[PDB]
């Protein structure tokens, strides 16, 4: 076999997605697989990836509940060697898009250099209070 | 949606739980995430976390005893830009209080700051021989 | 309990397998547990490690074909204090046979020092074309 060490500057990124809207269990984490795919083709990026069922605990922002629900850590190792703008774009585009899609509150976004970690987001809805 | 940047020293941390005692199955992870949200109110702390299933392989330190256990990593991202020693001494008491509450001999702890590890800990029973 | 701070270089490492045999669902997690324990034991190395199930997406590189597939995301911390270099060796021997032993096009290693990366390597089969 061939030991091919990667090409790039070492970018990559977790992305945390639950599957409760609001206290009531909505999502799997099939669902998650397959709209990450859906976002990603139509950026033009390869898709792959790992999904990580998980239990995630969550305070409301608005209500202060803690929601405890099942939710999805995906996690992208950058193989195409992209610039850093580039995949950064296109790793908070694919979040904002699952938390529109999962009708999610807040979505997790973590961006890694070399293991580095550049940037933690919270990609919040900005429903009308 | 608005793309929130994350305050303070980017902390996080890593625990990890195994669920037998000794070769006994014996927990589940539901009952790590019950316990850490009850240990982690009682700080004062966001219990916000994610819980991750594992399969988990531990070489018995007294006996040599090689046991494979179901186990859950407990995965924390700061979020309420806590001080290096406020969260550090917060973590390391949720870890020790696990290995207690779970009857464990090792609970391992990773403390990280922007993804960098500052610390791995082996918190260990200090049953009498 | 002792709160034992783990000495050494603060190695670290993630592998990752898939399940599937091209788009045929063949393998489960334990098989890679018990594969893992099996090759660490004769390279005479603590085999303690996680593994988290997950479900995987990868592009394959001859056919383009897209699969999603059950995986295994091996997560290993040295609490040996091995050399970069003796870690690194024996953490690309155990992914290479375990590409081998579970007929992948691909595994994925990823090695750290400190939680900063130091290489990823992808390990490609070189099946005659
Ligand atoms: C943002 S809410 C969606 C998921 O993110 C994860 N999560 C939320 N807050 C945290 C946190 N501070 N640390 C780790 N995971 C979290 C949990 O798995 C949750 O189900
Ligand atoms: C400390 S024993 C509890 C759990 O910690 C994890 N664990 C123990 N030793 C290691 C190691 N060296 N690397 C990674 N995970 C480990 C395994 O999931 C185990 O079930
Ligand atoms: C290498 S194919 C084996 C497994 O590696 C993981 N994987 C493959 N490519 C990536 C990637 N770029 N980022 C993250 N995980 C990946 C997926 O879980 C897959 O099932
Ligand atoms: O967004 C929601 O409504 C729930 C709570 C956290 C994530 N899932
Ligand atoms: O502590 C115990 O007894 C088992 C072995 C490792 C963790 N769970
Ligand atoms: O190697 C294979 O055939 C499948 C596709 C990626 C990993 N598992
Ligand atoms: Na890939
Ligand atoms: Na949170
Ligand atoms: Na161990």
């Given at each position: 076999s061939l030991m091919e060490r990667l090409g790039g500057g070492g970018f990559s990124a977790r992305i945390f997605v639950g599957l409760n809207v609001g206290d009531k269990p909505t999502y799997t984490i099939e669902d998650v697989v397959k709209d990450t795919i859906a976002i990603r083709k139509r950026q033009?990026?390869?898709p792959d990836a790992s999904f990580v069922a998980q239990r995630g605990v969550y305070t409301e922002?608005?209500?202060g509940q803690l929601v405890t629900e099942n939710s999805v850590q995906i996690i992208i190792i950058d193989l195409e060697?992209?610039?850093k703008e580039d995949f950064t774009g296109k790793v908070?585009?694919?979040g904002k898009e699952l938390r529109e899609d999962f009708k999610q509150e807040?979505?997790?976004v973590e961006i890694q250099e070399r293991g580095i970690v550049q940037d933690v987001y919270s990609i919040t809805a900005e429903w009308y209070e």
């Amino acid at each position: 076999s061939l030991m091919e060490r990667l090409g790039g500057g070492g970018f990559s990124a977790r992305i945390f997605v639950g599957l409760n809207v609001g206290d009531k269990p909505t999502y799997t984490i099939e669902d998650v697989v397959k709209d990450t795919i859906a976002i990603r083709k139509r950026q033009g990026i390869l898709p792959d990836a790992s999904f990580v069922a998980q239990r995630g605990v969550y305070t409301e922002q608005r209500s202060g509940q803690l929601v405890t629900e099942n939710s999805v850590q995906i996690i992208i190792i950058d193989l195409e060697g992209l610039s850093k703008e580039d995949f950064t774009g296109k790793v908070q585009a694919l979040g904002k898009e699952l938390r529109e899609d999962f009708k999610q509150e807040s979505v997790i976004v973590e961006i890694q250099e070399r293991g580095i970690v550049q940037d933690v987001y919270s990609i919040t809805a900005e429903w009308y209070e």
